[PDB]
Design a protein around this nucleic acid. Structure first.
Ligand code: FES
Ligand SMILES: [Mg+2]
Ligand SMILES: [Mg+2]
Ligand SMILES: [Mg+2]
Ligand SMILES: [Mg+2]
Ligand SMILES: [Mg+2]
Ligand SMILES: [Mg+2]
Ligand SMILES: [Mg+2]
Lengths: 168, 86, 293, 109, 115
RNA sequence: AUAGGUUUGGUCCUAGCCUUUCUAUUAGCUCUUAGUAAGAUUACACAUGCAAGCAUCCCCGUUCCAGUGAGUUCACCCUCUAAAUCACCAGAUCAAAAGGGACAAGCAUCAAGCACGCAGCAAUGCAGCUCAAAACGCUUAGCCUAGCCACACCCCCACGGGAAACAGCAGU
């Protein structure tokens, strides 16, 4: 069995469940939290569970942590404009913290879908190329069109080896 | 079955087995009810429930035992010591 | 004026008539199978899951629109008489711009005679399949749609399968789509297999065709036999709605046709098997009295 | 804005100040180990210009990218001392705090 | 490869197999190999008639317009294809080849009649 | 891996080796036909033939294509901005150089490198910078394949020298 408590945290399927994708302005996220205190339990469990998801969904945002530095836990987002967003997280569950950060700085589902539409624009079905980029390597694959010679030999009429004989 | 003669051992074992029958609950009479993870002594068995028509993808002894039981669809991976009795 | 197939009242009537058999709607598909997943649900959770399945079934049952047969295309863009004889094969030029809707794409054909005409509807569908391959559609028309194979499907009682194949292969306004749907409706009526399409998205189309062709006799007979009296009343009302000037409609307007009276009025007037319809209604009345008191 | 440095904003800890008007900051980023899929701190060293020379070893600092490097390695400049070493002021309440203890009770105002 | 000079060109990259020519209309840097890298693929051309006696041609007209605006040149076969499609005027060489074919056909008709 | 054989007088466990599967090269024996794909072992040396012209002279091209993998974190993203195309322009496209970040395998019996930093307009001052979270070093390898990087006989380069160059096609 996978090592560590809650090994589900170390599965791509789990790290893809993160619903928080920050706006392009968010650049740093500092998580101050206390390793003890029944009020800091929400921040502790947020760091334990959701920080992997946030970082996976946001590979360019610098996420840093700080244990037992201030009396109360809190998040602080440094944005590209110089603004700093302080989010108190005391008494809030990890789910509540995730929802709050999603509301204040996360990208809306509509914007995420717009990005996905931009992405799907690329793979034009009608393009022909290697299977990595295109659905079909050649027009031969389309039924009705003259088949690839490698599987169905072409007529001697079309083959150039005998067009040469007709030339002669 | 222990015996000096092979046929005697066969008789002994196949007569003593019928008095030691288990009953194996089969989901829909074709597969186990849930995934089973166990480690008997040094033999790890990981059995996965599978849908109808999936077949028996198991160690050959497990395939034989599943045919005997009445299990038709299941996956099974054996790890560690693969001592047949274990 | 007459009501369109997509009118709200028509949609409500057809949806009620189709039924909502969840088991049939979600019959286990014979496809690649993954192991089932299990959940522990209270009674409230089970009811909520059932209602979500009901919503999914309604979305899946959303009926295809009924479209009139598409007009043939014979537009010619340019007669470049100079090109006559320069080649002996048509050139089919397709606009493969991603954003353009498939019914606005420009698919032109340069003929050997030099004519640059718009592509026929058949060529349009063919090229659109070639360059935007849809799932379940084939370029060369499947042979299943030949009359003998269609009859084989009907004999096996696979009308839903035939309709699904037709919908996937052809467009709603396609000549082949129209012909195959009408043939399937004709076979279903002839052999009295109306129950096949119930709880499927094609029941509404079948009912609409029957009403438009004024042959609701068999469907009403089957509904009465299956004691779907509300559905029969709705069907008779829809028939009168779509034929306001019909004699049955006029009789209903005159008399107090507000229930089984509607079915009686239709059986009397504009029903080709009115005697059989009233015999079945008598049988149903006997059934009702067999448990009323 | 149109700066040629990759990291516009970074946050780190000062690990040395033996250079004139320059603070050495240790910026740690979570990096996903592809095999274990666990996140580990990966640390990198930045040179941040500091005119005031106020940065002290152990301070947590915020660094903003210069328009262009002012030296071979000095790409960033100190923009704020997020947590002065041992003089932390709780951003939430604003009172000075030592660890999880309020030096001045928030009730004092 | 740091290509000294050059410019974009909308041309027909050849694929298929032996005796089965097939073309991908590619907006490719002119100096790049015929079958090499390309900025964007703008459609296809099947020179061999299909079962329906058609030479299918796909043209991503929007992207072709975009690349013409960006300054891509047009290879002569692509110009001829667009002329046939009517997106462009018939190429002067298309017209002149048609006329030459007509004259040759007239000469052969005269020879056949003089028999 | 659905596993199998093999330690012992015998059993259990641990463990190595090997078998079964799928590719590619070579060899042995053997072989009828047609279509298609692919094809020196070597960065050793090369006979011979051909591979770059066009065009009313100027210009343009011969820097492309094609070739090889010797070398090797010049390949990817961002900033800036050359060259080139958009008939002149327009900013658009493309994309050098420069700056920032990322970027192979093995060996730590390669653990220290030896100036590898900063400040100042300069003068000059500070004494610093990298490194067991692997610096410095040695060996190996073309890569992350719509293709990309590097080399073009060697001296990294190529003024110059060694010398007379197929790693263009065919061929030896
Ligand atoms: S792959 Fe289509 S012609 Fe060969
Ligand atoms: Mg051989
Ligand atoms: Mg090498
Ligand atoms: Mg040694
Ligand atoms: Mg050299
Ligand atoms: Mg040589
Ligand atoms: Mg050669
Ligand atoms: Mg030789």
């Amino acid at each position: 069995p996978m090592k560590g408590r809650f090994p589900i945290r170390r599965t791509l399927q789990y790290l893809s469940q993160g619903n928080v994708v920050f706006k392009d302005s968010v650049k740093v996220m500092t998580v101050n939290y206390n390793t003890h205190g029944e009020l800091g339990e929400g921040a502790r469990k947020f760091v334990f569970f959701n920080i992997p998801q946030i970082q996976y969904k946001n590979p360019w945002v610098q996420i840093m942590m700080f244990k037992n530095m201030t009396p109360s836990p809190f998040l602080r987002f440094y944005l590209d404009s110089g603004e700093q967003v302080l989010v108190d997280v005391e008494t809030k569950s990890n789910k509540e913290i995730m929802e709050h950060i999603r509301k204040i700085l996360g990208k809306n589902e509509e914007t995420l879908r717009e990005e996905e539409e931009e992405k799907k624009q690329l793979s034009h079905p009608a393009n022909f190329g290697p299977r990595k980029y295109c659905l079909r390597e050649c027009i031969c694959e389309v039924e009705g069109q003259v088949p690839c010679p490698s599987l169905v030999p072409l007529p001697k009429e079309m083959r150039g080896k005998y067009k040469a004989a007709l030339k002669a | 079955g222990k015996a000096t003669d092979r046929m005697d051992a066969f008789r002994k074992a196949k007569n003593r087995a019928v008095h030691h029958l288990h009953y194996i609950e089969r989901y829909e009479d074709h597969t186990i009810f849930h995934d089973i993870s166990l480690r008997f002594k040094r033999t790890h068995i990981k059995m996965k429930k599978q849908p109808k028509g999936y077949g028996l993808r198991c160690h050959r002894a497990i395939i034989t035992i599943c045919r005997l039981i009445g299990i038709k669809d299941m996956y099974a991976k054996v790890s560690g010591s693969i001592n047949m009795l274990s | 004026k007459k009501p369109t197939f997509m009118d709200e009242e028509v949609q409500s009537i057809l949806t009620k008539m189709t039924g909502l058999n969840l088991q049939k709607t979600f019959k286990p598909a014979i496809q690649e199978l993954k192991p089932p997943t299990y959940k522990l649900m209270t009674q409230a959770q089970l009811e909520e899951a059932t209602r979500q399945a009901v919503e999914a079934a309604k979305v899946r049952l959303k009926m295809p629109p009924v479209l009139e047969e598409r007009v043939p295309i014979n537009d010619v863009l340019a007669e470049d008489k100079i090109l006559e004889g320069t080649e002996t094969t048509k050139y089919v030029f397709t606009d493969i711009s991603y954003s353009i809707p498939h019914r606005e794409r420009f698919i032109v054909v340069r003929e050997p005679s030099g004519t640059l005409r718009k592509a026929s509807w058949e060529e349009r569908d063919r090229m659109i399949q070639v360059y935007f391959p849809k799932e379940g559609r084939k370029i060369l028309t499947p042979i299943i749609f030949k009359e003998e194979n269609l009859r084989t499907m009907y004999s096996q009682d696979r009308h839903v399968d035939v309709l699904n194949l037709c919908f996937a292969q052809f467009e709603p306004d396609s000549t082949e789509y129209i012909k195959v749907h009408h043939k399937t409706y004709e076979d279903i009526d002839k052999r009295g297999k109306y129950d096949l399409l119930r709880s499927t998205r094609y029941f509404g189309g079948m009912v609409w065709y029957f009403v438009n062709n004024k042959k609701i006799d068999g469907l009403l007979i089957d509904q009465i036999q299956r004691d779907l009296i509300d559905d029969a009343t709705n069907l008779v009302q829809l028939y009168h709605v779509l034929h306001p000037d019909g004699q049955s409609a006029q009789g209903a307007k005159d008399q107090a046709a507000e229930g089984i009276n509607l079915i009686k009025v239709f059986a009397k007037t504009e029903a080709q098997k009115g005697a059989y319809i009233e015999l079945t209604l008598q049988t149903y009345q006997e059934a009702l009295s067999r448990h009323s008191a | 804005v149109r700066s040629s440095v990759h990291a516009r904003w970074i946050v780190g800890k000062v690990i040395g100040t033996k250079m004139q008007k320059t603070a050495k900051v240790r910026v740690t980023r979570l990096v996903l180990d592809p095999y274990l899929l666990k996140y580990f701190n990966k640390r990198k060293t930045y040179f941040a210009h500091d005119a005031l020379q106020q940065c002290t070893v152990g301070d947590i600092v915020l660094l903003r990218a210069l328009p262009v490097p002012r030296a071979k390695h000095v790409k960033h400049e100190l923009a704020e001392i997020v947590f002065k070493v041992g003089k932390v002021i709780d951003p939430v309440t604003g009172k000075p705090c030592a660890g999880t203890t309020y030096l001045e009770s928030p009730l004092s105002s | 490869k740091a290509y000294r000079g050059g410019h974009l060109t909308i041309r027909l990259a050849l694929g298929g197999c032996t005796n089965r020519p097939f073309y991908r209309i590619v907006a490719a840097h002119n100096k790049c190999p015929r079958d090499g890298r390309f900025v964007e693929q703008l459609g296809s051309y099947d020179p061999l008639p299909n079962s329906h006696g058609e030479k299918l041609v796909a043209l991503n007209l929007d992207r072709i317009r975009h690349w013409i605006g960006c300054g891509a040149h047009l290879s002569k076969p692509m110009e001829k294809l667009l002329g046939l499609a009517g997106f462009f005027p018939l190429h002067p060489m298309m017209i002149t080849n048609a006329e030459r074919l007509r004259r040759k056909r007239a000469r052969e008709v005269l020879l056949a009649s003089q028999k």
